[PDB]
Write a protein that binds this DNA or RNA. Structure first.
Ligand SMILES: [Zn+2]
Lengths: 249, 73, 48, 61
RNA sequence: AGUGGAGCCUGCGGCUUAAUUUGACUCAACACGGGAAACCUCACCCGGCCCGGACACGGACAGGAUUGACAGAUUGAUAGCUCUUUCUCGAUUCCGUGGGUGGUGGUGCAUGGCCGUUCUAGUUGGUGGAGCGAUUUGUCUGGUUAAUUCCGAUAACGAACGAGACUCUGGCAUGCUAACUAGUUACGCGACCGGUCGGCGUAACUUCUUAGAGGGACAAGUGGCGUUCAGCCACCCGAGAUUGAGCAAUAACAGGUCUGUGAUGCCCUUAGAUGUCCGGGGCUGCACGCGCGCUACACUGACUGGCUCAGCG
């Protein structure tokens, strides 16, 4: 009716947005009942990068973790993948949006990180750009470990182990079941004939560099079996060094 | 390679604007009687979702809730 | 669930994994009229 | 002159702040540093006194 | 036919200016960046807010760290990135000090894929022969060709690569295949003075239009010149006797190109390898040179009315 004329107007605002106070109709989108119909009129694919940051800034604050997750999954995350493929580097506002998306870590992990690695088509460049934001923003220990467990159980790709390393790089105290998944993750390549990248060894390095205190003799010697079958001229002696100078409990 | 010198220069960004810390704002909401009766000073918001607990701000003339953006006279 | 485990000493937190993997109008008309009110005040063409 | 060996001289000043266009013999690296040398003649301080105090016996610290 | 002379427009110098962003300077410098710049483009200038990692140390927080926020008042801006309002939001921490082990970095090399530049006719083996060897022969007396082309001679014989060849295109068809988004002719009805009608309605099938197949030119034929051969010149008939393009996927590049990998080498990261945005300017500024253009300098013209014809798109 008349509401369709209001949002078709703001469609032409958000497509040419750069700065300033947004129209008040846009700021009350997650308060609506039929919000997904409204969002399609505004045309999220035709939006400017600057608009995308303030769009994310709205959804992260207005509660509802389930409503927040589905915005990232349908609008935000495709746009990130669209620009890394096109411009090869990410836009500033689009980057700033992702840091603002971490105000709800539950909706972040279930909407951005986990769906990205599950697709399989995730490139190395895509992984580092998003993964650096994990290093910048502090994440709750419960949510940090929960994302870490999924990636450990997940199918292996080059992009996948980058995230896993950066989560261990945070150096939080870990739940014990997560450690069991991480050991089982790396020991899954013990019989593998495939040539493993350097980023894989660095992930195994960071695991032993920090969490050598929480490794029992059973899994500790299972790791020494892993390096004996899948070696590296540079990094494998360092992991061998870190295991031999480890004090348990 | 030929190393760059690195210059000094001091400009103070130590002075930066931070909003004022209001200490213990819970006592302003309720006035407790000597017997044990609870009296609410501020208007409680009767919105869709933010009911029973969320108060409205006391403007010089009107009332304003801080979650749903409800305004009065 | 794995084989080789924690073995010895301390269990501080139990951890909740069963939420992550196990997952997968009057006011509107007021804002609408406020939008047109603003889109009129941007170009005045009248006042003295 | 230039750390990577280029010999140039200033052309125009542009900004109200200290910005200048500068000609060079070759193309400069981005990793480079431009630098000019200024010279003045310096003469010593007149601090002559023939009197010098007697030192105590020298030792190692 | 001009330009160079004139006015104007634009380019490059130069000159100004806060800025008048910019590589190239006798072809490949010179309306090249598709560059017709009010904004964006914009790289340039004058201003103004905003925040700028991880790490270690010292401080604050559940007696809220912090986020988000209606209206009003501020400066060049509807700045919740300030105050009245402090109302919500529950750790998603931020307040000072630093020391190297900073990465949406920059550049250099090893290596993995892919371009452009000069002419446009050559380039390069293999095997054999000649020389101690550098080297030579092949790659040549002669004629001939755009040509290491061809005839042919022969201590050479054979190749590969490109040019050539391949493909398209255009010229030609009153032969053929068709065309309700092409057109004609004839026939009806109508309008007009036996004719004119881009008026309207289906029997004629391709002349025009289209888009396909098949033809058609091969030095075919004749004459002259030619070691009587390779070839060259002239001429009849013919639409065409010497169409133009791509392919064709060379030689030299020490010009290289690109989100490929190297726990790659260095340099930088409150000196952000152009930080995002906000407002206003500048790119046009003008004594002058050097230049491409447009309009002109009239009578073969200008003005005025009338008349009638395209094609790429
Ligand atoms: Zn509210």
């Amino acid at each position: 009716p008349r509401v369709l004329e209001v949002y078709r107007g703001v469609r032409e605002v958000l497509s040419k947005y750069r700065s300033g106070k947004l129209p008040k109709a846009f700021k009350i989108i997650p308060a609506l009942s039929n919000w997904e119909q409204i969002l399609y009129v505004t045309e999220p694919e035709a939006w400017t990068a600057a608009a995308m940051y303030q769009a994310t800034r709205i959804f992260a604050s207005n509660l509802k973790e389930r409503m927040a997750q589905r915005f990232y999954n349908l609008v935000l995350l495709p746009r990130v993948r669209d620009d890394v493929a096109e411009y090869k580097r990410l836009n500033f506002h689009l980057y700033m949006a992702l840091k603002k998306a971490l105000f709800k870590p539950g909706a972040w992990f279930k909407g951005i990180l986990i769906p990205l690695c599950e697709s399989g088509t995730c490139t190395l460049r895509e992984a580092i750009i998003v993964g650096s934001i994990i290093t910048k923003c502090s994440i709750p220990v419960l949510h940090s470990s929960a994302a870490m467990l999924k990636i450990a159980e997940m199918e292996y790709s080059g992009a996948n182990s980058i995230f896993l390393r950066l989560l261990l790089d945070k150096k939080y105290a870990l739940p014990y079941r997560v450690l069991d998944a991480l050991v089982f993750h790396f020991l899954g390549f013990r019989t593998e004939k495939r040539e493993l990248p350097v980023l894989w060894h660095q992930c195994l390095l960071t695991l032993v560099q920090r969490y050598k205190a929480d490794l029992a003799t059973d899994q500790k010697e299972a790791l020494l079996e892993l390096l004996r079958l899948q070696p590296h001229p540079q990094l494998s002696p360092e992991i061998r060094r870190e295991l031999q100078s480890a004090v348990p409990r | 390679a030929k190393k760059r010198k690195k210059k000094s220069y001091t400009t103070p960004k130590k002075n930066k604007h931070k909003r004022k810390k209001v200490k213990l704002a819970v006592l302003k909401y309720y006035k407790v009687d000597e017997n044990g009766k609870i009296s609410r000073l501020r208007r409680e918001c009767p919105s869709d979702e933010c009911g029973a607990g969320v108060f409205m701000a006391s403007h010089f003339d009107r009332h304003y809730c801080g979650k749903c953006c409800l305004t009065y006279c | 669930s794995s084989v080789m485990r924690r073995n010895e000493q301390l269990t501080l937190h139990d951890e909740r994994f069963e939420k992550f993997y196990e997952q997968y109008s009057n006011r509107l008309q007021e804002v609408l009229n406020d939008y047109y009110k603003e889109k009129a005040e941007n170009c005045v063409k009248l006042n003295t | 002159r230039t750390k990577w060996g280029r010999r140039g001289h200033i052309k125009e000043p542009l900004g109200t702040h200290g910005h200048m266009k500068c000609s060079f013999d070759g193309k400069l690296k981005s990793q480079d540093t431009v630098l000019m040398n200024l010279y003045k003649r310096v003469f010593p301080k007149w601090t002559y006194d023939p009197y010098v105090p007697e030192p105590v016996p020298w030792l190692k610290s």
